[PDB]
Copies of this chain bind each other. A is one copy, B any other.
Amino acid sequence: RPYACPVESCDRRFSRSDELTRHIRIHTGQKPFQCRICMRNFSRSDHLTTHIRTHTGEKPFACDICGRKFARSDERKRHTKIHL
């Protein structure tokens, strides 16, 4: 488990370099990605896409039992648990 967070307060360790680098961003407040629509900055590109579905109403994802729709899969995973 080779990549060590080299900030002092943090012993956190990562299996790959892309992991660490992404992690460092939380000590830096760095948010690359910007919303073409709200001007809000976020730390990652995947989150900015899930984010965008908040304006556009994009909503992949369906509850197999009631076919209610959600913006993300975590949302439907969690939703589906309420039928059982």
Contacts and interface: CB of A to CB of B under 8 A. Distances in A.
A55 to B, nearest CB: 24
A15 B77 CA distance: 11
Contact of A81 (B15, B78, B82): B15
Interface residues of A, number: 5
Contacts of A25: none
Contacts of A82: 15
Nearest to A14: B81
Nearest to A82: B15
A16 B81 CA distance: 9
A16 B82 CA distance: 10
Interface in A35-69: none
5 contacts: A15-B78, A15-B81, A15-B82, A16-B78, A16-B81
